[PDB]
A and B are shown apart, each in its own frame.
With several copies, the nearest count.
Chain A
């Protein structure tokens, strides 16, 4: 993703 998770 961009914040919470790694993608």
Chain B
């Protein structure tokens, strides 16, 4: 058989591969670079624009644009370059051969799916397509049918409660805190220690400081006192040029804004209170199964100690006879792709695809008809 593609556009990373594989063939940043300086040498083989690992490699010459932000595609001519690179250069497969599966954050604009569909059939000429809610796929990955899923990548965070494969749309919470807003906060706070980062090519440095050094405090105000009193907590990092920077009590302050969006001036409650309020909107027969199956998903949940901090601060809210368990598998950065990889391999699914014969009759609005 022709296996289908699974392509988790996400934001910030593209994850792609064939259904039935256990990890993606292609993981590269969803970033398009254009050169800003004057090219002076002649015969250099100048190239209009760079995608992914190239734009990361040459980033010092480039201006880097993400075409997707908050799970919304904001520039289609970039995004189509990213798909073109994914199919032809990175997977080295012609998409006209076999179906494609795409993933989207819930509750985002209706036109985004119509444009994705129109591009997939018109330019890439895919034989059939489907789009699937990421947080649903995270359950397929973690091997469950009853869950509440905190799925948090770059761009967007959302909670979806699912009971025995019935989703509860009225209870779906979406929040726009994400790895990119922890990064922009880490930029505005590192400045306290004099370090400075003003360009995209070094926003990509701060993005990797955040990944290695940052961690989540099990209780915030005592570690704030500790690392204000003893320097033993602070750690140091070599910038690309060889300068050494040092980061102390800061390296737990940026991921803790997930629990206090007030630090960046948002009104809304952190991931713990939005998780609890999402459970509270569910009807009371299912709350015990939701409290047991809290599933972490996506990369922004990778910070050390976010599991124990969640279990603590939800147990501070839950009724004390209940039992609260946070399921944080180590693969979890890929779980949306793994779930889509198994979903697309199910023989039952093969009916679900939007085929081109349907699209040519109904137009791109068919998605709202046949998808979720």
Contact = CB atoms under 8 A, between A and B. Distances in A.
Interface string A1-7: 1111111
A2 B69 contact: no
B348 interface: no
Contacts of B74: 7
A3 B72 contact: no
B73 to A, nearest CB: 9
Interface stretch (B20-28, B159-167, B188-196, B327-335): B188-196
Nearest to B72: A7
B239 interface: yes
B278 to A, nearest CB: 12
A4 B197 CA distance: 6
Given A7-B69, A7-B70, A1 B195 contact: yes
Nearest to A5: B196
A1 B109 contact: yes
Interface in B248-286: 280, 284
B176 A2 contact: no
B198 interface: yes
Contacts of B245: 2-3
B222 interface: no
Contacts of B70: 1, 5, 7
B194 A1 contact: yes
A6 B277 CA distance: 9
- B contact patch SS: loop
B67 to A, nearest CB: 10
A4 B109 contact: no
A3 B196 contact: yes
A6 B284 CA distance: 12
B74 to A, nearest CB: 5
B80 interface: no
A7 B64 CA distance: 17
A4 B280 contact: no
A1 to B, nearest CB: 5
Interface string B160-196: 0000000000000000100000000000000001111
| Max count, chain B CB within 10 A of own CB: residue among A2, A4, A5 | A4
A3 to B, nearest CB: 4
Contacts of B243: 3
B202 interface: yes
13 contacts: A1-B109, A1-B196, A2-B193, A2-B194, A3-B194, A3-B195, A3-B196, A3-B239, A4-B196, A4-B198, A5-B70, A7-B70, A7-B74
Interface of B: 69-70, 72, 74, 109, 176, 193-198, 202, 239, 243, 245, 280, 284
Interface of A: 1-7
